Design a protein around this ligand. Structure first.
Ligand SMILES: O=C(O)CCC1=C(CC(=O)O)c2cc3[nH]c(cc4nc(cc5[nH]c(cc1n2)c(CC(=O)O)c5CCC(=O)O)C(CCC(=O)O)=C4CC(=O)O)c(CC(=O)O)c3CCC(=O)O
Length: 250
């Protein structure tokens, strides 16, 4: 044998080593670019945050930490404004980061943007939305619906690897791969947004090539593109997906 393509970037050497040990032929087809691009307005947005906001929404633990570090690098007091804000955490990791900063959240979702919808207050003012490398339109528009002016805090843009996506699509369509492992929802997005033939690609991943998802969020992204995942690891570990996929196959 099974040729398994990995759409990931970070753990590609770990994936290769473990796949080989489990009797697979690993293939590395990252769909994200190594380069992040800074968001020019970000420093200005953190300075605005420092002026006080009504809501603060945290999406990731790493994102929370990085925002707090950015406030320090800029010589600002963020903990004061954040202490006064009504704070939401999208999931436990965002929540844990807030708690560790002395800023425990007032509401926590289940790790999905959608789980925050019922938790959002109606009101007026500024809602600061912590992001890292990707916009969250469902949540951003939901905030505007609720009456709030949205202040994005996205330091970077995650970028696709356009030629790499095209190569991966060809490999899938030409039968060079038996399975394709996705470890983040953004990899699914990049691939289907970058595909020359997204209808053919969907068909292949439904009929010929097994789409493997590490995590429910990744699996939901496949489903939104009309792809039924062959295997979903809800342990959310790459190692576990590979062992679990081996059994599912037989
Ligand atoms: O390699 C991995 O880390 C697993 C795959 C993964 C990727 C892709 C890859 O790395 O190959 C990935 C891409 C992202 N990195 C993101 C930010 C980070 N998460 C990071 C750690 C995580 N990667 C977590 C899972 C992932 N997030 C997850 C699981 C999750 O997304 O819930 C986390 C923990 C997230 C958290 O702290 O709340 C890290 C640290 C990585 C490092 O320093 O080695 C960063 C910053 C960085 O890219 O360096 C974000 C979030 C965003 O932009 O809002 C995303 C989008 C996630 C998605 O679409 O599902």
């Amino acid at each position: 044998t099974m040729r398994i393509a990995y759409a990931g970037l970070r753990r590609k050497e770990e994936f290769k080593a473990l796949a080989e040990k489990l009797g697979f032929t690993p293939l590395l087809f990252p769909v994200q670019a190594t380069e992040k691009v800074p968001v020019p307005e970000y420093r200005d947005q953190v300075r605005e945050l420092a002026q006080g906001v009504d809501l603060f929404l945290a999406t990731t633990g790493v994102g929370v930490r990085d925002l707090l570090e950015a406030g320090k690098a800029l010589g600002l007091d963020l903990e004061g404004p954040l202490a006064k804000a009504f704070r939401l955490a999208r999931g436990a990791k965002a929540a844990r980061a807030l708690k560790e900063a002395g800023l425990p959240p007032h509401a926590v979702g289940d790790g999905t943007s959608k789980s925050l919808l019922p938790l959002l207050p109606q009101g007026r003012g500024v809602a600061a939305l912590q992001l890292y490398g990707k916009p969250l339109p469902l949540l951003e528009n939901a905030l505007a619906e609720r009456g709030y002016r949205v202040l994005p805090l996205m330091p970077y843009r995650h970028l696709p690897d356009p030629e790499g996506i095209l190569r991966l699509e060809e490999a899938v369509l030409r039968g060079e791969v038996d399975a394709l492992a996705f470890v983040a929802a953004i990899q699914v997005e990049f691939l289907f947004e970058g595909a020359k033939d997204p209808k053919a690609l969907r068909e292949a991943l439904n009929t010929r090539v097994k789409a493997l998802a590490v995590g429910r969020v990744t699996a939901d992204a496949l489903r939104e593109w009309g792809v039924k995942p062959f295997y979903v690891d809800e342990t959310e570990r790459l190692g576990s997906l590979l062992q679990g996929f081996k059994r599912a196959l037989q």
